[PDB]
Amino acid sequence: IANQPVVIDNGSGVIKAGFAGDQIPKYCFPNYVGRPKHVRVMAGALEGDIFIGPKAEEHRGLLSIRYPMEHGIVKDWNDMERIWQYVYSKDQLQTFSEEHPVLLTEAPLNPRKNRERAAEVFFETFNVPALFISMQAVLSLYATGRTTGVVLDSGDGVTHAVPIYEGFAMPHSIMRIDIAGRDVSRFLRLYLRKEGYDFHSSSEFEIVKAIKERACYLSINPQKDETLETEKAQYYLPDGSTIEIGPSRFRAPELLFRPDLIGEESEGIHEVLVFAIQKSDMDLRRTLFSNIVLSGGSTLFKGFGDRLLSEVKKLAPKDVKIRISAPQERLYSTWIGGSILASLDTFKKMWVSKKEYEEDGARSIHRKTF
Amino acid sequence: EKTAVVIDLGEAFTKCGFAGETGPRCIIPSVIKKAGMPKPIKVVQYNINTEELYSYLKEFIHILYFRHLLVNPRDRRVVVIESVLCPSHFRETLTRVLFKYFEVPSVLLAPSHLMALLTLGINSAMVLDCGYRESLVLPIYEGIPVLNCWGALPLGGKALHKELETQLLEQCTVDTGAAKEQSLPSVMGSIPEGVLEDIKVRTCFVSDLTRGLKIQAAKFNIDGNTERPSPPPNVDYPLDGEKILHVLGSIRDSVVEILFEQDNEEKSVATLILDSLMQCPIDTRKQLAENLVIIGGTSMLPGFLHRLLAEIRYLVEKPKYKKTLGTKTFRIHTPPAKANCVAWLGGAIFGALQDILGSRSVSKEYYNQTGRIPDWCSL
Amino acid sequence: KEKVERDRKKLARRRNYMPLAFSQHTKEIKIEPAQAVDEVEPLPEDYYTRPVNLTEVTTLQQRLLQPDFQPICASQLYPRHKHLLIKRSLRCRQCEHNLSKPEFNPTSIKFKIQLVAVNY
Amino acid sequence: AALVVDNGSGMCKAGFAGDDAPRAVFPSIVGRPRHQGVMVGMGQKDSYVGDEAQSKRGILTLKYPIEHGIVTNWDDMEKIWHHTFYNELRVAPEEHPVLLTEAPLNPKANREKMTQIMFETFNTPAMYVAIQAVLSLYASGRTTGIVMDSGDGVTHTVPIYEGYALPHAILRLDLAGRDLTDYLMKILTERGYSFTTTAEREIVRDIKEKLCYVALDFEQEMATAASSSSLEKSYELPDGQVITIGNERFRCPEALFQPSFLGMESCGIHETTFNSIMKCDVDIRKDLYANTVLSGGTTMYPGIADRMQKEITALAPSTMKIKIIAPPERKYSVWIGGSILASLSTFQQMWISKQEYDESGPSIVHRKCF
Numbered sequence A: 001i002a003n004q005p006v007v008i009d010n011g012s013g014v015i016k017a018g019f020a021g022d023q024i025p026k027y028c029f030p031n032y033v034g035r036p037k038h039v040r041v042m043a044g045a046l047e048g049d050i051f052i053g054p055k056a057e058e059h060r061g062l063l064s065i066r067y068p069m070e071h072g073i074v075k076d077w078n079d080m081e082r083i084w085q086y087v088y089s090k091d092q093l094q095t096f097s098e099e100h101p102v103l104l105t106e107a108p109l110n111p112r113k114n115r116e117r118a119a120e121v122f123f124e125t126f127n128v129p130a131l132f133i134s135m136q137a138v139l140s141l142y143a144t145g146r147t148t149g150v151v152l153d154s155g156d157g158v159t160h161a162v163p164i165y166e167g168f169a170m171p172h173s174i175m176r177i178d179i180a181g182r183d184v185s186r187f188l189r190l191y192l193r194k195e196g197y198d199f200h201s202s203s204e205f206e207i208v209k210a211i212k213e214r215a216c217y218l219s220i221n222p223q224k225d226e227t228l229e230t231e232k233a234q235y236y237l238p239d240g241s242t243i244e245i246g247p248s249r250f251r252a253p254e255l256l257f258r259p260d261l262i263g264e265e266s267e268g269i270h271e272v273l274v275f276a277i278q279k280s281d282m283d284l285r286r287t288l289f290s291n292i293v294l295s296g297g298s299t300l301f302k303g304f305g306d307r308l309l310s311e312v313k314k315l316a317p318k319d320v321k322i323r324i325s326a327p328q329e330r331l332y333s334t335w336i337g338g339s340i341l342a343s344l345d346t347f348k349k350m351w352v353s354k355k356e357y358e359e360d361g362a363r364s365i366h367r368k369t370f
Numbered sequence B: 001e002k003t004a005v006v007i008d009l010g011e012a013f014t015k016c017g018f019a020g021e022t023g024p025r026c027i028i029p030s031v032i033k034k035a036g037m038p039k040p041i042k043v044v045q046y047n048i049n050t051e052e053l054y055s056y057l058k059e060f061i062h063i064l065y066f067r068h069l070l071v072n073p074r075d076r077r078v079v080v081i082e083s084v085l086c087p088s089h090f091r092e093t094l095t096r097v098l099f100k101y102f103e104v105p106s107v108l109l110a111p112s113h114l115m116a117l118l119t120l121g122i123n124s125a126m127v128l129d130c131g132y133r134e135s136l137v138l139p140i141y142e143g144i145p146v147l148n149c150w151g152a153l154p155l156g157g158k159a160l161h162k163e164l165e166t167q168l169l170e171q172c173t174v175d176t177g178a179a180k181e182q183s184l185p186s187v188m189g190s191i192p193e194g195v196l197e198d199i200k201v202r203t204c205f206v207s208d209l210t211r212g213l214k215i216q217a218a219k220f221n222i223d224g225n226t227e228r229p230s231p232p233p234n235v236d237y238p239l240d241g242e243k244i245l246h247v248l249g250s251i252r253d254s255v256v257e258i259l260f261e262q263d264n265e266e267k268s269v270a271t272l273i274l275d276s277l278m279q280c281p282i283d284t285r286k287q288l289a290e291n292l293v294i295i296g297g298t299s300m301l302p303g304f305l306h307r308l309l310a311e312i313r314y315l316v317e318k319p320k321y322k323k324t325l326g327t328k329t330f331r332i333h334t335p336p337a338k339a340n341c342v343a344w345l346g347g348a349i350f351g352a353l354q355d356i357l358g359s360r361s362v363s364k365e366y367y368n369q370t371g372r373i374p375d376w377c378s379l
Numbered sequence C: 001k002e003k004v005e006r007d008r009k010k011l012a013r014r015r016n017y018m019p020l021a022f023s024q025h026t027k028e029i030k031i032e033p034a035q036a037v038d039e040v041e042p043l044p045e046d047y048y049t050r051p052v053n054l055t056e057v058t059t060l061q062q063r064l065l066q067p068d069f070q071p072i073c074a075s076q077l078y079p080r081h082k083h084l085l086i087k088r089s090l091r092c093r094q095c096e097h098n099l100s101k102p103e104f105n106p107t108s109i110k111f112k113i114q115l116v117a118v119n120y
Numbered sequence D: 001a002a003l004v005v006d007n008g009s010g011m012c013k014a015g016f017a018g019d020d021a022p023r024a025v026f027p028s029i030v031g032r033p034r035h036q037g038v039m040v041g042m043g044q045k046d047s048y049v050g051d052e053a054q055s056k057r058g059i060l061t062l063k064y065p066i067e068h069g070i071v072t073n074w075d076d077m078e079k080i081w082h083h084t085f086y087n088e089l090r091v092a093p094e095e096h097p098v099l100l101t102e103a104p105l106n107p108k109a110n111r112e113k114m115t116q117i118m119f120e121t122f123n124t125p126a127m128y129v130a131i132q133a134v135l136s137l138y139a140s141g142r143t144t145g146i147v148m149d150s151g152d153g154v155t156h157t158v159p160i161y162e163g164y165a166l167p168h169a170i171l172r173l174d175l176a177g178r179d180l181t182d183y184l185m186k187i188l189t190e191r192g193y194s195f196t197t198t199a200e201r202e203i204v205r206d207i208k209e210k211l212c213y214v215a216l217d218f219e220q221e222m223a224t225a226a227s228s229s230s231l232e233k234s235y236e237l238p239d240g241q242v243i244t245i246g247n248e249r250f251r252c253p254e255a256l257f258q259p260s261f262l263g264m265e266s267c268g269i270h271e272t273t274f275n276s277i278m279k280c281d282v283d284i285r286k287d288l289y290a291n292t293v294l295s296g297g298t299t300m301y302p303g304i305a306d307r308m309q310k311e312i313t314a315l316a317p318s319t320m321k322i323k324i325i326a327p328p329e330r331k332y333s334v335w336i337g338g339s340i341l342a343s344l345s346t347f348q349q350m351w352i353s354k355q356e357y358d359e360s361g362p363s364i365v366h367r368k369c370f
């Protein structure tokens, strides 16, 4: 069917939907299911037992937040079906899923059962004309408009580094670590309890993510800022109460660059970028260092590019040019890539038709992926 | 060398005594009776000005070191037991009081969970700490606390005391002694915390899982006609002499259920062990599960350990925990001292080790030089 | 063992010989760890359908005065020995001595060295 | 009285010369704890080694000191040798002379620094380094024939005819047990079961050793794996959790025979064994086909010998008879050779003494290596 394809980013934190024609995603809402915290027997309470996106944000304190997708993998599929149904609601897009074809953006090196079940839902529950699963990293390059480039895509659920040179992705050089934005939000909650402010509730976890997003700066030297006495910058909560964050502000997102501090066995965001380049062939190393692209929401931390440049330089070889080319629209970069890809006439060949999936089998989605 | 003193500053009660003893010498409510104030102010209070906190701790430590313990503070060392993720400014103040005013030789800031493990003798064990403020859990594997897989919920003494006060005010039946033989509701606007605590301990008990699960659905009244078990007999409690409060049988076995209630989120005192254990490393699972430790005075409540261990094994079969923690054998450790004084006993056992104490502990000469207490946060 | 290890490590750092092997390098006490019970004793069925006398059960205050084995029942609760009191002596930061009390403070209101702001 | 100490990348096999099997066999690893700023409990060792670190895997970060038969961290290797002599063997290194094993075509600094430690740190009376492949022949009572000694670190092919080695015919391949273990993690992550940490990698090695087997026809085995669930076997982890690895069982050891899977762009363990024989003189080829030995624990895969024979026979001429020599004790084939060599009265002269080391230096080893 010729009618405009619907791009949808499967972001663990925030799913971004919209049409391929639009330069930006019109409808982007948080990826969580909202049910009433108190188990509702009586009338005059929150009805439906389902609150998604803007409806949830309004009555947030009353509801109990449950993320359906963890570490770029779908844990509860029933929840994810309701989320994708809300994408084709009167609230967002307001269209038939049966008419328009779909593009998914699954993280690299995900389970094959995750891709197979994702297709089954979108072909059976929704009567889609055609579906195409793609890598988040490959899209990010289409948006910026360069063929060569390493893509350090720090999402909410997963942070992954994929090196692609002249439209060729080395699949062995891909590096994936689970320590992402959501873990930084979890570790900030621990440090906030060490400052003396508890956020025990699942609703109260959402305002820790807001505190992180508002006020958390990455110091170039962490040891000097610790010895220096903090200003203790006040943050205002939804109720109106003030909280002085203090040293927790800067030593929370540090755990990205040094995850051994809390006690998580991972490489680190500076390390995975360098290791991904060093794993690739010697001839390409210089060009891959010379073309690095930051993607996702967990790069927007104040002074992230400043710290990463410094942490990469000392690990990388001496007298090598390191350009970390961040776009202005890092959060919405992954979708814009899909929107451009979808618009091209080549995409018509790439996607798998509904009749193709019935005849060919299950492999059809996997083999056409690349 | 002299036998080092052990102090354990809590919101409800403080444990005090000397190292290498069977239990604590003095255990008292963590308050101070200041002139003018009718009700005594609580000594540990998080999120206040440092100068006001300094004065309260100076007043309290003085009472511990002279009226309760009889020993010179400057002469012998200190082993300060405090829970992990204790507020930064509070711990900084407590040390600054001991080092500046009292001029103690050296303080050792031991985490309560690692101390509780020493008392049993086992090197690795899961430790739940159901205290006053928050019921915290922290897996300890072969001497190393795993901060990565922490867990805390506000389902302790404070949350239970508040729940009791609410229920009593609804079904309020007091005999004032002024033509008040007939049921008189809410004669007093608020009930003092000292009374509520005494009612909780004597009257209220923890129900069986089978009876408790019925009580949860009963008070909910989820499309059912009077589906509650038969309650215990109503106990009459004296308030301030003449006033006799008749405590309803339902309140006794329903007040506790707020701890073990699911409340949609799936966040109980029971769930917190399994939520933490599932997040732990794959190799450590079977060792931690087999070695459970239940400290804190909230777990002293009669029939708490049976309900918890039962509620665990029920929540195991639930589909979320069924995959990972399905075929696991959960066995509880019985510590030598009572559930309240497990934390203290560890510090005393550690305090008896004079050789290791001096090395690990922070000396006054170091603090006066630097002015930087070591913590699990960055240096 | 840790003291000997820490001492051996510290004198090796102080020596600064880079762990030079001049000589050859390198009875045990084993406690049995407490056995974990499969099922803890349940709450007795007496507690259900029995009048609770507040005289028989003990309050928190009198429970906690006997901390070594704080008993719920009154019949278990034994009388503890009477707590000894203290005779304070004050010493300043800059000054050395200030005031003190006799060796027979029992049944005496005499100060060995009387010093107070009202007396100067 | 003499000591044989195999310095394998996977496992360190140590024992007394003359004995049938090695006394102490432990995994060659150093376990440093994921420590926070929180104080540690009692009975605390700063760095654990071997069977102790294998017991306390959960918390300790496992770091293999030898990578591809090259000692990367010498301070770590020193702590293993200290655990080998003093604790494991219960013997003084000053009394007994120590035979060590190095893989062929290793860096010269490796052999140089190895002996320097043995002479200075441990103060051994004599030290001789030997090629692992040269020892492995003595195990089978064969002077003539090639060996395919595939270890955890490296795999090497050393052709030796009538007690004379062909040095130029020796070929080294970096593909080995640890690369297969790393490969098995990736394909298990594709199935669903994610293994990231260093402790988890050790559990994946236990899965590999027990289940994984070499297929005769890979394409035929993949067809049976797709149709029927007969090849699918269950394994219990340290946790009660059980996993069904499926087709990935026989997919892991395939990487040996076709490195393209791992993405090395090199010849297979079958093809390198053929290439090594062709590099040798035309006359002696006959005996090398007739006496092809498989050594190390990477040749203890069920049915590698059958697959090896098939692949060599196809490449080799039709008239030639290809017999693969697979003794029951392949894992201890390097050590048992060392025990036979050290015991022989002829070898008494070949030892490098302290006096010889003191006068000449550490460079003497390169002359009296092989």
Ligand SMILES: Nc1ncnc2c1ncn2[C@@H]1O[C@H](COP(=O)(O)OP(=O)(O)OP(=O)(O)O)[C@@H](O)[C@H]1O
Residues within 6 Å of the ligand: D006, D007, D008, D009, D010, D011, D012, D101, D132, D150, D151, D152, D153, D154, D177, D178, D181, D205, D208, D209, D210, D295, D296, D297, D298, D300, D301, D302, D331, D334
């Ligand atoms: N029965 C088995 N089946 C399959 N793989 C095995 C088996 N036993 C061991 N392995 C794998 O092969 C490796 C064999 O290591 P081994 O014990 O031979 O020591 P090594 O370090 O390779 O020594 P060397 O290089 O001297 O042979 C192990 O690390 C493991 O990954």
Ligand SMILES: Nc1ncnc2c1ncn2[C@@H]1O[C@H](COP(=O)(O)OP(=O)(O)O)[C@@H](O)[C@H]1O
Residues within 6 Å of the ligand: A009, A010, A011, A012, A013, A014, A015, A154, A155, A156, A157, A181, A182, A185, A209, A212, A213, A214, A295, A296, A297, A298, A300, A301, A330, A331, A334
């Ligand atoms: N301005 C910001 N500053 C700091 N962190 C941010 C900011 N915006 C988003 N984040 C973090 O990044 C997350 C968004 O990740 P996102 O880019 O949507 O991932 P994905 O690429 O998988 O869609 C948020 O949940 C939050 O943790």
Ligand SMILES: Nc1ncnc2c1ncn2[C@@H]1O[C@H](COP(=O)(O)OP(=O)(O)O)[C@@H](O)[C@H]1O
Residues within 6 Å of the ligand: B009, B010, B011, B012, B013, B014, B130, B131, B132, B133, B157, B197, B201, B296, B297, B298, B299, B300, B301, B340, C063, C070
């Ligand atoms: N022996 C007991 N029996 C029953 N309940 C008790 C007992 N001792 C204490 N409690 C209750 O449990 C709580 C235990 O708190 P505690 O652990 O002493 O304080 P903290 O957590 O601040 O160290 C008290 O506030 C009290 O309500």
Ligand SMILES: [Zn+2]
Residues within 6 Å of the ligand: C092, C094, C095
């Ligand atoms: Zn003076």
